Design a protein around this ligand. Structure first.
Ligand SMILES: NC(=O)c1ccc[n+]([C@@H]2O[C@H](COP(=O)([O-])OP(=O)(O)OC[C@H]3O[C@@H](n4cnc5c(N)ncnc54)[C@H](OP(=O)(O)O)[C@@H]3O)[C@@H](O)[C@H]2O)c1
Ligand SMILES: NC(=O)c1ccc[n+]([C@@H]2O[C@H](COP(=O)([O-])OP(=O)(O)OC[C@H]3O[C@@H](n4cnc5c(N)ncnc54)[C@H](OP(=O)(O)O)[C@@H]3O)[C@@H](O)[C@H]2O)c1
Lengths: 418, 418
């Protein structure tokens, strides 16, 4: 029965604690957990070897369907070469820009009963990429499921304790066949239905991944000139990601980039055979709504046919209305690790990787994305200037390269094969 | 010498204290003061009969050119029938919608040496109206000067003590002849130059009055549905005049009324032979600026040629940027006086009078002002509904009529005579 399948969760961020409780609440399944040997991973590795129990609390509205819970972990590993045995479901709970690096380390031959791979918070192209790797390992039978985003808001640091403040209202998902009635899809639905989360099946993996909010919203905000300056000059007074100038990036040019990047993704998706979303309807009706006195229902329903300038006005009004807890989101800065090496924070590092992969894919398909190109040009120039200030020898290698090129190639190969 | 002329200030709000100090600092002139016999007027009447001295303090930036000062009042009256004698300058420091009621009570025959009448914070049409009345009293010689607005921010309640927080950067003024070089104009300039206030002379009275910010900004904000509801249902949680919905009125429909009313005034002014202002340049460059990252210089310079929707976007951005101390301005509610009679607060009562007078004038000239008409229709219906809730017998007469009709007629008569 699918709600008893031994399940290995790859990545032990706070979402994995919520997820683990949700699986254990839905059936009696053996649960495995992986986390890289960071300092946090090591402390959780030590803790679990003593008491293999994670703890979760529901908070605010989430308390309606999530109370104090505990869940047992039957196996914990910190090396993916140890991801072996009778596991039948892998769930990728690492960020999407790390799926490739993770999947390349899994010894697929040592997972003879593997049935499904779930992408907990996907990006556009994630599913095609994962299909391609699995097909190369002789795992074409395995069901690949992309979820449009993680289904909650969950936070820690005691690394075995988390709390969930809120659940999303809906998640879009799909497997590579567009088969809505699969046992795994039914299982996921049951898992999410415990928190009143609707599940909406899509025709293919990309047709679900297109509903990843952060691909639309983060790059314009996080890669604005003033946000990049806060990021790379850590001594400035803090900026806030969703506030208007001069406290944060929101302003007409930034909103123009938000609208233009949505235009770019429509171009890319359409080329890939996938319909574009209605960005404003998605933001308002699937994520966080604002009063109709600010953003009219006409603006929402007709957004894709509105002229650019009216699209922009509507989006500026939306983000203004939002701030009346978006106003608390700070812009994180570059930072040094224990070896004194400089890092980028996950915003924008993850967003740059996700968008670069898609920009490289678009170029391979003869699709121009001028807003995406402008955004990454601006980031890359600021990053180069930062590396020169601090010295390349003092930068973590993540600042100096990535494997977006190989990913775009893999995604292109898989898509053309269909 | 014009800086020694005996001067009678009509109206003793806090601005009159600043004004009185400014006159006394500029020359040795006998100073008179009028205030109606309100409770505040009576207390000031009593105080001055004991110690005829007003007190002023400069505050924040105003402290650069205004320190602790005192000024002696040589004559105080509370009946306009006592506005008689050798006064050579009258300054109307009452609100513009009360010029008519005041001027009709002045015994002009008993002011044989009257040389000038200054409108401290004018409205459009004020000067034409005052000219007409003076001409009827045989005072066509008297110089009529409209100032676009009061030149500072001044507040009290000890009615003989005020404080000024800030001075304006420029004031527009004119006399009926467009004669920039008059001794009175020079005197006013000298008076305002002590606070680094620029004075900009205009071709005629209306060509200065067109720079009255409150005629443009107050009616859309104060007469918005949600603001009228706060005004007439005093038990609601307070609204704020400049905040976005739902804490205040700012939203796309309200901004659309701001832009549309400016279009209406352009129609009316043009009919009267006067060029319209650039609203956005005036707001930003003559009143309170916002960063160019929010409102571009292109938006400011080209505002009158921008399409309506772009005008609106620019204005919404402007008012959003303003809130990053506009955010402290509360919407005042209806209130009862000592006799338990209901009143409107000065916002919107003054604004309704000023706009109704102009709407009646426009109709006489065959000029349509649809936004002005919609705004006053909405106000009048809400006012009628309020009077029914409380009872007409429990309403102050100001709620039940006005003399805007006679004023529009007088203004029309004066204008046609030219
Ligand atoms: N939690 C939420 O409310 C939320 C909200 C929005 C999106 N999401 C998405 O949902 C997924 C799970 O998020 P999460 O909040 O549980 O935790 P997370 O911060 O995304 O990290 C999850 C796991 O990936 C590892 N990780 C993070 N960055 C890494 C990097 N540069 N390189 C290698 N490993 C890295 C982490 O290791 P360490 O923990 O040892 O550092 C962790 O084991 C992610 O796809 C995230 O994007 C979650
Ligand atoms: N002070 C500022 O910073 C400021 C800012 C913007 C505009 N203004 C303008 O500058 C002028 C002077 O303003 P102010 O602040 O000194 O005081 P004010 O509140 O405008 O009142 C000035 C005088 O007019 C009387 N008054 C007010 N409303 C009246 C009404 N419905 N009926 C009869 N009399 C009335 C007042 O009598 P009582 O005092 O006895 O009630 C007072 O003697 C006005 O044109 C005002 O519109 C001033």
């Amino acid at each position: 029965m699918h709600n008893t399948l031994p399940t290995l969760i790859l990545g032990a961020g706070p979402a994995a604690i919520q997820l683990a409780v949700d699986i254990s609440a839905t059936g009696d399944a053996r649960l495995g957990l992986y986390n890289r040997p960071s300092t946090k991973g090591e402390r959780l590795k030590q803790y679990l070897a003593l008491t293999p129990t994670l703890y979760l609390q529901g908070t605010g509205k989430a308390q309606a369907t999530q109370k104090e819970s505990s869940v047992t972990i039957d196996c914990y590993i910190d090396q993916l070469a140890q991801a072996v045995g009778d596991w039948q479901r892998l769930i990728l709970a690492v960020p999407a820009d790390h799926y490739y690096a993770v999947l390349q380390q899994i010894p697929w031959a040592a997972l003879p009963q593997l049935k499904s791979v779930i992408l907990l918070s996907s990006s556009m192209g994630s599913g095609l990429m994962v299909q391609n790797l699995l097909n190369a390992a002789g795992k074409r039978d395995v069901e690949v499921i992309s979820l449009s985003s993680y289904y909650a808001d969950t936070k820690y640091i005691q690394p075995y304790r988390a709390y969930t403040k809120a659940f999303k209202q809906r998640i879009y998902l799909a497997n590579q066949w567009g088969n809505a009635g699969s046992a795994e899809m039914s299982w996921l639905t049951a898992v999410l239905a415990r928190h009143h989360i609707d599940t909406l099946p899509c025709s293919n993996l990309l047709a679900a991944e297109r509903f990843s909010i952060t691909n639309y919203v983060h790059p314009p905000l996080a890669l604005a000139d003033t946000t990049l300056q806060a990021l790379f000059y850590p001594e400035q007074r803090s900026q806030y990601l969703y506030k208007t100038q001069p406290e944060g990036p929101v302003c007409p040019a930034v909103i123009a980039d938000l609208a233009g990047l949505a235009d770019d993704y429509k171009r890319l998706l359409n080329r890939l055979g996938v319909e574009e979303i209605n960005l404003l309807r998605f933001l308002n009706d699937d994520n966080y709504p604002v009063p109709a006195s600010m953003v009219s229902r006409r603006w929402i329903d007709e957004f894709p046919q509105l002229p650019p300038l009216e699209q922009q006005y509507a989006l500026f009004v939306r983000y203004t209305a939002l701030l009346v807890d978006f106003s608390a989101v700070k812009v994180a800065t570059v930072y040094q690790d224990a070896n004194a090496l400089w890092h980028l924070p996950r915003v924008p590092l993850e967003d740059v990787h996700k968008l670069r992969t898609l920009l490289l894919l678009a170029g391979a398909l003869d699709v121009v994305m001028p807003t995406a190109q402008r955004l990454l040009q601006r980031f890359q120039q600021a990053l180069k200037a930062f590396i020169d200030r601090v010295g390349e020898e003092h930068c973590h290698p993540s600042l100096l390269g990535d494997d977006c090129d190989r990913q775009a190639a893999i995604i292109e190969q898989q898509w053309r094969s269909q």
